[PDB]
């Protein structure tokens, strides 16, 4: 048997463009015209962007393009914008009711501005307290690239315990977002002068502090 052959790397820079290969055989891509191009975000829906070798779906943007050339179908995504980072799989009709897929391509943009994160600290809410538990959410958002560390602090002295810190998702703007949490008893909470959230990105350190004051 066999798959379909794409190469796993189509890198380009913004404004520019990229040109992905999907090679089949005269049994799938060669003979039938039904070659489709999926766009897929990390472990999210994929969707049809190209379907009958090349044609526009309506709500698919104006510049992903498909080509056929023998055993080979090609997507050329012209003009490159950030978000085009994805995984693009092809599909080729075989016969006797069966569709076969590709190795897929991870697409990468370059020249995307780097961002130092917005760091929002959240003190333990009123009800959290009424229930008698306390949690601190450091919301580390809007960064790029996706390397960022987190540290919490007792009071100057550190907190290397209690903390769970999710590691970085990607959002609607092709910028990354992560969070960190200190789970503590309100004892602990009302005991200390302040609890910090230190967040470290491409050399730019940020520290946000929280003191029992709140409004919550």
């Amino acid at each position: 048997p066999s798959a379909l052959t794409q190469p796993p790397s189509a890198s380009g820079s913004l404004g520019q463009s990229v040109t992905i290969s999907c090679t089949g055989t005269s049994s799938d891509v060669g003979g039938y015209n039904y070659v489709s191009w999926y766009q897929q975000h990390a472990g999210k829906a994929p969707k049809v962007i190209i379907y009958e070798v090349n044609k526009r779906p309506s709500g698919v943007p104006d510049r992903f393009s498909g080509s056929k050339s023998g055993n080979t179908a090609s997507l050329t995504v012209s003009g490159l914008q950030a978000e085009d980072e994805a995984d693009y799989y092809c599909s080729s009709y075989e016969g006797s009711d069966n569709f076969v897929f590709g190795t897929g391509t991870k697409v990468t943009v370059l020249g995307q501005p780097k961002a130092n994160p917005t760091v929002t600290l959240f003190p333990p809410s009123s009800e959290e307290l009424q229930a008698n538990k306390a949690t601190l959410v450091c919301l580390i958002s809007d960064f790029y690239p996706g390397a960022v560390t987190v540290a919490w602090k007792a009071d100057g002295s550190p907190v290397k315990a209690g903390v769970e810190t999710t590691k970085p998702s990607k959002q609607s703007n092709n910028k990354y977002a992560a969070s960190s949490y200190l789970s503590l008893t309100p004892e602990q909470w009302k005991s200390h002068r302040s609890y910090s959230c230190q967040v470290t990105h491409e050399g730019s350190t940020v520290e946000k502090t929280v003191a029992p004051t709140e409004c919550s």
Copy 2:
């Protein structure tokens, strides 16, 4: 569109019959009797394991039952093997220009006891408002298996905009954790009576309700 609701996570032990749904919004009910179940394992690509409602593609093992009882496609793995662990996306071709995939269902083979999320909602920090910002963060912790839905409400109204759910991460306790933020303008924050955060997970659903209150 996002027009085929699929569960966040399904799970069983080796031997359990795991049923999976694609519930379609209004549209072509009894109108696309042409739904397709597709796998994705980590790092592979989408093997379509069901076409035309109940039809098995070449070499799909008979375990992988399929039906569409009424508005609802229901795949059924009628004997869980380890390798069944995968994402599952349904699909519907609603007229040439329109291919739709379900939201996606993750199948886990039970490796820990099942553990429903602790939904904890944080309200805009006092200070943050002092800076004219409004952000809420729904924190979702300590769940298994790690595949969870999030929905927000502005007064029982899906807040469709400004939402940024992340992706499950392994916590040192070997359970998952996610978080959805919501960026807002102060005025809009006050101008709503309540805000809730509803997190769907394997039958259980948790919704946490929040409201504007002051200090200042």
